[PDB]
Amino acid sequence: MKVGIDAGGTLIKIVQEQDNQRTFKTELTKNIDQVVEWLNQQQIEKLCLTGGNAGVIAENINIPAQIFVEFDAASQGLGILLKEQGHDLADYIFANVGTGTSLHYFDGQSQRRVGGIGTGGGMIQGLGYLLSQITDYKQLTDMAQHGDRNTIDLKVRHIYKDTEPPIPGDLTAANFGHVLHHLDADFTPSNKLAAVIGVVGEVVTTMAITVAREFKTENIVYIGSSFHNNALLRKVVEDYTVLRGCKPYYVENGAFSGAIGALYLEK
Amino acid sequence: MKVGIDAGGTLIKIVQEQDNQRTFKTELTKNIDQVVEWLNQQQIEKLCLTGGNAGVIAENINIPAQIFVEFDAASQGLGILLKEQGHDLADYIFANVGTGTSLHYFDGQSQRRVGGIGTGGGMIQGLGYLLSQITDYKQLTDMAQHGDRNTIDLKVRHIYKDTEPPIPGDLTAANFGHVLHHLDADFTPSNKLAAVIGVVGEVVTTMAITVAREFKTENIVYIGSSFHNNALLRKVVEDYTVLRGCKPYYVENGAFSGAIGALYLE
Ligand SMILES: Nc1ncnc2c1ncn2[C@@H]1O[C@H](COP(=O)(O)OP(=O)(O)O)[C@@H](O)[C@H]1O
Numbered sequence: 057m058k059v060g061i062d063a064g065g066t067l068i069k070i071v072q073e074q075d076n077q078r079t080f081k082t083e084l085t086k087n088i089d090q091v092v093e094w095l096n097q098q099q100i101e102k103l104c105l106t107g108g109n110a111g112v113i114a115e116n117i118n119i120p121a122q123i124f125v126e127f128d129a130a131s132q133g134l135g136i137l138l139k140e141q142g143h144d145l146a147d148y149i150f151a152n153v154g155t156g157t158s159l160h161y162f163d164g165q166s167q168r169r170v171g172g173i174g175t176g177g178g179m180i181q182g183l184g185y186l187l188s189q190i191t192d193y194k195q196l197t198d199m200a201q202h203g204d205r206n207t208i209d210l211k212v213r214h215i216y217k218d219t220e221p222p223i224p225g226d227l228t229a230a231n232f233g234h235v236l237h238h239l240d241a242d243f244t245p246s247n248k249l250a251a252v253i254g255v256v257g258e259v260v261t262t263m264a265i266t267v268a269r270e271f272k273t274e275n276i277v278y279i280g281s282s283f284h285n286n287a288l289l290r291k292v293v294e295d296y297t298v299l300r301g302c303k304p305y306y307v308e309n310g311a312f313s314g315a316i317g318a319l320y321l322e323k
Numbered sequence: 324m325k326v327g328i329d330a331g332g333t334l335i336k337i338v339q340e341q342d343n344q345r346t347f348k349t350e351l352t353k354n355i356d357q358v359v360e361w362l363n364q365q366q367i368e369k370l371c372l373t374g375g376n377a378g379v380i381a382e383n384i385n386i387p388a389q390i391f392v393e394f395d396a397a398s399q400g401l402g403i404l405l406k407e408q409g410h411d412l413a414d415y416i417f418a419n420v421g422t423g424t425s426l427h428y429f430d431g432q433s434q435r436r437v438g439g440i441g442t443g444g445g446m447i448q449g450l451g452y453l454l455s456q457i458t459d460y461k462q463l464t465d466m467a468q469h470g471d472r473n474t475i476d477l478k479v480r481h482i483y484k485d486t487e488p489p490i491p492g493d494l495t496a497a498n499f500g501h502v503l504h505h506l507d508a509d510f511t512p513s514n515k516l517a518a519v520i521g522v523v524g525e526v527v528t529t530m531a532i533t534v535a536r537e538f539k540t541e542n543i544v545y546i547g548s549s550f551h552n553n554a555l556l557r558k559v560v561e562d563y564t565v566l567r568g569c570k571p572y573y574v575e576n577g578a579f580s581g582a583i584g585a586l587y588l589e
């Protein structure tokens with residue numbers, strides 16, 4: 057009975073491994089007390105921890121547990137998941153889009169943190185609440201899917217008008233930039249929520265394509281729970297990566313890269 | 324009288340020049356018709372245009388005018404201003420933070436667009452209105468200055484708690500990340516406004532420090548009107564640039580590097 061736990065700022069990713077049988081459990085960081093209660097209830101052969109609140113679990117647990125650096129764990133697990141899903145990538149940039157975004161570069165041997173930004177899921181949830189007053193994650197993300205950004209976001213062509221723009225006119229010039237041109241029109245909580253996800257997506261992708269260029273790689277692997285139930289963010293990210301001449305990748309159970317990695321670093 | 328005009332998405336920057344003494348005019352893009360009216364009533368030896376709405380002016384004007392690419396003009400006017408103010412920088416990343424942000428690299432000869440982002444002044448104004456129903460620029464920018472982001476932004480140390488973080492704990496982990504931990508506390512339009520400027524600043528600086536590393540340079544020059552009346556954004560940007568081992572620079576009349584550039588170009 058082997059168990060790996062990535063206790064982040066928002067979600068706790070549990071990976072149970074029994075006689076070559078993987079289980080993917082996901083409880084909130086908000087309800088960490090219930091995760092410790094559960095863990096205490098059973099004998100685990102080897103326990104491996106990673107992420108922010110990994111110490112919290114370690115303190116309140118009455119069982120020994122090894123602790124690993126999330127940056128190294130995420131990379132390990134991603135390697136495992138990519139080759140399992142038939143991806144043989146020599147090099148790549150991997151974006152861990154969690155509460156906040158952590159940018160890494162993998163050179164076929166090891167990872168290196170090459171950047172990070174505070175535009176992740178925590179912003180989708182945070183700014184999402186201030187613009188819709190919705191606290192439920194599913195509800196917020198689902199609401200956002202068919203929202204219109206035309207009245208909210210400003211495009212390059214809107215500034216350049218008839219004039220030939222020096223970069224693609226369809227591109228977003230200014231996020232929320234159109235808001236003051238549409239003071240008459242009602243800003244729907246859907247339209248507004250779409251625009252939050254749009255800016256978060258565009259920032260993560262811009263940062264990701266920049267370091268992909270820097271470390272001379274065309275492969276970008278996107279991981280983290282921010283992608284769960286948010287198909288709009290996935291398309292926002294995916295479409296821009298392609299437009300920036302890069303190859304986007306989404307791994308199944310990629311938000312468990314951390315947790316999986318913890319199990320395969322001890323041995 | 325030689326005149327340069329950078330007609331952007333939000334502001335029109337006019338720099339008129341008459342015998343080594345300059346004039347720095349600002350008129351809104353909203354009131355472009357008034358700018359054309361004035362120019363038609365002005366005795367201009369040489370007219371140079373740049374930016375988004377440069378064509379609009381050129382069409383409605385009854386005087387010929389040379390049109391230049393803003394990416395090249397900005398670079399030109401910036402170097403004139405840089406040198407004049409005693410900055411002799413070999414190489415430098417320059418961020419033109421206007422309605423939207425554009426990122427360039429200057430190799431002691433010419434510039435190259437190396438990035439861009441939709442997180443500029445247009446976002447401060449746009450998201451600023453949705454979070455405060457304030458349309459007045461000055462008002463929006465002055466309210467933000469005395470705003471607290473503790474209840475709004477999430478820091479690395481908040482996630483890592485007592486555990487030693489793998490990057491500085493004081494750093495912003497997630498913008499608006501704290502909002503759901505403070506649902507009890509009611510979010511002041513000033514606290515909210517500082518968070519908008521904070522994220523805009525942090526995105527521009529992160530992107531700027533990344534390309535500064537990429538094109539092997541430590542100098543970062545920040546320009547655009549987004550810095551006007553917004554001391555908070557300036558400090559947000561300035562402090563992070565330094566923390567990332569880079570040299571930040573703010574040039575006097577930097578938001579005119581486009582209208583200056585246009586004059587001294589061909
Ligand atoms: N059930 C959920 N509850 C809360 N946030 C969720 C949920 N599913 C996905 N998310 C998203 O995932 C983000 C956290 O990402 P995650 O990869 O788990 O990061 P961390 O490891 O820092 O907790 C949240 O900010 C939110 O966008």
Ligand SMILES: Nc1ncnc2c1ncn2[C@@H]1O[C@H](COP(=O)(O)OP(=O)(O)O)[C@@H](O)[C@H]1O
Pocket residue numbers: 330331332333334335374420421422423443444445446447448460461546547548549550551578
């Ligand atoms: N009086 C003002 N009214 C509106 N915006 C202003 C004003 N002064 C400065 N700004 C700021 O400058 C930004 C535009 O910057 P600017 O350098 O003119 O770029 P652009 O060329 O895209 O117009 C605005 O979005 C706003 O944040």
